[PDB]
Amino acid sequence: NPDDYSLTLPVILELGKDLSKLIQHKTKSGQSFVDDMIPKMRQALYQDIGIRYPGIHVRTDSPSLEGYDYMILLNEVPYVRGKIPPHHVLTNEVEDNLSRYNLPFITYKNAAGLPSAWVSEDAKAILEKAAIKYWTPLEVIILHLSYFFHKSSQEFLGIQEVRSMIEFMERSFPDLVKEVTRLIPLQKLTEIFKRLVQEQISIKDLRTILESLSEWAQTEKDTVLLTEYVRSSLKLYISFKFSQGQSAISVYLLDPEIEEMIRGAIKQTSAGSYLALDPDSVNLILKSMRNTITPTPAGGQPPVLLTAIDVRRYVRKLIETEFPDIAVISYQEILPEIRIQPLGRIQ
Amino acid sequence: PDDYSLTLPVILELGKDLSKLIQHKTKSGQSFVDDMIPKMRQALYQDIGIRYPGIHVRTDSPSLEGYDYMILLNEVPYVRGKIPPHHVLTNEVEDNLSRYTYKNAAGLPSAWVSEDAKAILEKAAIKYWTPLEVIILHLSYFFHKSSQEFLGIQEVRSMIEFMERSFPDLVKEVTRLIPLQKLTEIFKRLVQEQISIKDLRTILESLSEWAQTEKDTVLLTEYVRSSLKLYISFKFSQGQSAILDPEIEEMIRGAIKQTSAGSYLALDPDSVNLILKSMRNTITPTPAGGQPPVLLTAIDVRRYVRKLIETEFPDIAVISYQEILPEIRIQ
Amino acid sequence: IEQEKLREKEAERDKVKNHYMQKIQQLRDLLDEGTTSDAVLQIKSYIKVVAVQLSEEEEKVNKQKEVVLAASKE
Numbered sequence: 001n002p003d004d005y006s007l008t009l010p011v012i013l014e015l016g017k018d019l020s021k022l023i024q025h026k027t028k029s030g031q032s033f034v035d036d037m038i039p040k041m042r043q044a045l046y047q048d049i050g051i052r053y054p055g056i057h058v059r060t061d062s063p064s065l066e067g068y069d070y071m072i073l074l075n076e077v078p079y080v081r082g083k084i085p086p087h088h089v090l091t092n093e094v095e096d097n098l099s100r101y102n103l104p105f106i107t108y109k110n111a112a113g114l115p116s117a118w119v120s121e122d123a124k125a126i127l128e129k130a131a132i133k134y135w136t137p138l139e140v141i142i143l144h145l146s147y148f149f150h151k152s153s154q155e156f157l158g159i160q161e162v163r164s165m166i167e168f169m170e171r172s173f174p175d176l177v178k179e180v181t182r183l184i185p186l187q188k189l190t191e192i193f194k195r196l197v198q199e200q201i202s203i204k205d206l207r208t209i210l211e212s213l214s215e216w217a218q219t220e221k222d223t224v225l226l227t228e229y230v231r232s233s234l235k236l237y238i239s240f241k242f243s244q245g246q247s248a249i250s251v252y253l254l255d256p257e258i259e260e261m262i263r264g265a266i267k268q269t270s271a272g273s274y275l276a277l278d279p280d281s282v283n284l285i286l287k288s289m290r291n292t293i294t295p296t297p298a299g300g301q302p303p304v305l306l307t308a309i310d311v312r313r314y315v316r317k318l319i320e321t322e323f324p325d326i327a328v329i330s331y332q333e334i335l336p337e338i339r340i341q342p343l344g345r346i347q
Numbered sequence: 348p349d350d351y352s353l354t355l356p357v358i359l360e361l362g363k364d365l366s367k368l369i370q371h372k373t374k375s376g377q378s379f380v381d382d383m384i385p386k387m388r389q390a391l392y393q394d395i396g397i398r399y400p401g402i403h404v405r406t407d408s409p410s411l412e413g414y415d416y417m418i419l420l421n422e423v424p425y426v427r428g429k430i431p432p433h434h435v436l437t438n439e440v441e442d443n444l445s446r447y448t449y450k451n452a453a454g455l456p457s458a459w460v461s462e463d464a465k466a467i468l469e470k471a472a473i474k475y476w477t478p479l480e481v482i483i484l485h486l487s488y489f490f491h492k493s494s495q496e497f498l499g500i501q502e503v504r505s506m507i508e509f510m511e512r513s514f515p516d517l518v519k520e521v522t523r524l525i526p527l528q529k530l531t532e533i534f535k536r537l538v539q540e541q542i543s544i545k546d547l548r549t550i551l552e553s554l555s556e557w558a559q560t561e562k563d564t565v566l567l568t569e570y571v572r573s574s575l576k577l578y579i580s581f582k583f584s585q586g587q588s589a590i591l592d593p594e595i596e597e598m599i600r601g602a603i604k605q606t607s608a609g610s611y612l613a614l615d616p617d618s619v620n621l622i623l624k625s626m627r628n629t630i631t632p633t634p635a636g637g638q639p640p641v642l643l644t645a646i647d648v649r650r651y652v653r654k655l656i657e658t659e660f661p662d663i664a665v666i667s668y669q670e671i672l673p674e675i676r677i678q
Numbered sequence: 679i680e681q682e683k684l685r686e687k688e689a690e691r692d693k694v695k696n697h698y699m700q701k702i703q704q705l706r707d708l709l710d711e712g713t714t715s716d717a718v719l720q721i722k723s724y725i726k727v728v729a730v731q732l733s734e735e736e737e738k739v740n741k742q743k744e745v746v747l748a749a750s751k752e
Contacts, residue, residue: 039349042349043349046349046352052349052351164351165351168350168351172353172501173501174501175500175501175504175527176499176500176501179500179527179528204352204354204422205354205421205422205423206354207354207421207499208354208421208496211499211500214500214528215532218528219608236420236421236423236425237421237423240423240424245424253709256706308722309722331715331718331719331722332719334715335715336714336715336716336719337714337715337716338714338715339712339713339714340712340713340714340715341712342709342710342711342712612727613727614727616701616721616724616727616728619720619724658716658720
């Protein structure tokens, strides 16, 4: 009825005409864009991150786009535009490889955690013979949406979805849930989940999170310290995420002078410990950041930063602004069986 | 539609060859998946008082070779494994290798011998393990060393409500004094030191005596230990009577800090070397697959000792004077 | 006699100071070695322990400096 209210549409994907005709047809594996690929994206995200992401509204034939351009909308507001080179597919291959078979490469780094190497799409069987995986431009859209939903956790974890997952949990763990909701109010619990998924910490393993809450919230009602204790009880997931299956984890470290000047950050005069810190140092550390970083390749994940226990979150809150692709952890969030390889000396 | 999914507790990934092996029956004709895993669960429950969940088997892992295996804790892999092809794991005496090596986990034997030799080992009174039985042993070591994540509050509730079927007024007396979270914490503090909680009755009687008077969880755990004299003595003396330095005892009076809700090890750090240096030069190596010897402490400092020495020698049991039967007989 | 007390207290503070800097150096050199997380957690806990002993020694030194200044103002 045109005389009611309407609910805000979360995520809209506009296409120009050529992509809208391209999503008509089946792929090599015969799959539909709308009926197979998007749901499989959602399920894979749910296995990766503990988040139920909403379904996607795709509108064809945008007035505002060329035919090989696409746009993504947050809450009926466009968020970022994209382009696709015509008749090219995106696979991350080293410049060495891009010239070791004599194929074209077009450098176009479309978003930040995505490959930057476009090769003419007639070369597909060549890349299959060379055992190089390539992505359909539709699969490129899928990858860019996935990067969105990783980077845009914050806007989709509000209180009603937290309630929905807690009420799913009640079916199995009702007295645990009742203890948790005696200890933690629902808004503050949602805040804890948000501050977890800030650093790409999955909350798929709800059981361990709830157990750690029911331990630690016996005493402490600050949301952020409880988030820290949840991290320090997710040692196993953090170690598997960042040490990538090895005997060892290869991280960066701080300088202890930096650690002992981030004891400067204390703000006991205010309720929260907001940042009381020499303004120049936001360059002064950060220069030594920029000359230290290894550029990870685009399909993997960045090098890790290992900090002292109490200053992990302040480091992450500082360095997300330019480098959202840093995971900050501290000593308590890894297994004390792992050997840590000291290979940054950042002063 | 889409919904939520529950975290799967224990997933066992198999390579192709093990996945073909688990189709067929074993030497005594009983099944890996339908008998041996349930029998492992039943034996674990009989030994320690813990209801472990059923086991999620995926065959044909892309990421493992065919005699390789992987174990997942909450859909996060915990340790990878290997099996030498066509070998069975039989602890030998090393000289045997020339009268007739892979240490897999730190409580598994390190001697794989080619599997054709079965009648030799049966005649020679040598116990052998199927590689399936080796998987069973490594899973058992997992669940011993990973008790803590399977004794949570809802399982404690389930066992309490099983108890209510028989001892409901005992249960109500216990839960009038003690919240369920603190009871689960007591159970965790018990099963940290591999103290079984199968015998719920004696634990509940000790609780219903002592929790009239004491509301600290840790003293109540100590009193449950001191009421499980019989179980501790039978575990540790192996049915015998007789199979530590005062200066350390008189320097652990240093560790009185109790200003906050808990206690605090308040000690000159260097003593963490003073115990350990003498510790390694005192220990008897008990035969691989046996029971390490047992450490006797003063009554109020037992937990501090156990918390201290677990880090390098996790499989050595700290007890104190009150926790043995009162009739059983280096620094 | 108060100068001798001051020497006593400054020696008793300086032994603790030397131990604390030894612990800091051992922290730093086991960070440089590539030890495990057990080692660093335990040494940080023991540093948090010996911080209180260092602060008690500093407070005793401040009291003794008070008394020595008072005896000088005699």
